[PDB]
Design a protein around this nucleic acid. Structure first.
Length: 117
RNA sequence: GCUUGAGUCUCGUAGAGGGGGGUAGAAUUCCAGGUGUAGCGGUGAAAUGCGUAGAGAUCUGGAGGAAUACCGGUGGCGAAG
């Protein structure tokens, strides 16, 4: 409907997935799409190429809004995160800045006991 | 008998030493919302499980429990824990 020209992107980046969702600095969501929502499975769904395709299916999914400026909130380990930031840059968005917003607890809770092979 | 051992008094310095009572910010979880769709989750690959009664993701508000990131250093205190 309307125009923003400067939105916000959020790349949740797990070791198993990398979901990318956009809003306009208001929490009112606009467009979301996952690396897993495109037929990919197994290790294939955890590749930076899956990140590229995901970026493309958000970029096309936002053409009506047509923002020309982006800020990216990269969170969590990213295998595919490393390449997602420049795919959007090429998708017709002059990314202003990147920000590592990975939440760090002040020893609030006991973490789960990780893999023990 | 004596004052060197051992004790007492006057004056200050450092400290995660101990007990009790207050309070604070991140973080996880749940609930109430607003937006928002087909996925989420995990794996060697899957499956159980979760999702159209609207999940996952995003912003706001609330509730409860536990512990206090950097400072931090084989640095400090304590008879040991």
């Amino acid at each position: 409907r309307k125009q923003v020209s400067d939105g916000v992107a959020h790349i949740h980046a797990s070791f198993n997935n990398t979901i990318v969702t956009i809003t306009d600095r208001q929490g009112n969501a606009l467009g979301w799409a996952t690396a897993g929502g495109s037929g990919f499975r197994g290790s294939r769904k955890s590749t930076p190429f899956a990140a590229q395709v995901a970026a493309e299916r958000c970029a096309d999914a936002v053409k009506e809004y047509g923002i020309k400026n982006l800020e990216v909130m990269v969170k969590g380990p990213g295998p595919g995160r490393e390449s997602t930031i420049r795919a959007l840059n090429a998708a017709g968005f002059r990314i202003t800045n990147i920000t590592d917003v990975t939440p760090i607890p002040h020893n609030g809770c006991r973490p789960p006991k990780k893999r023990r092979v």
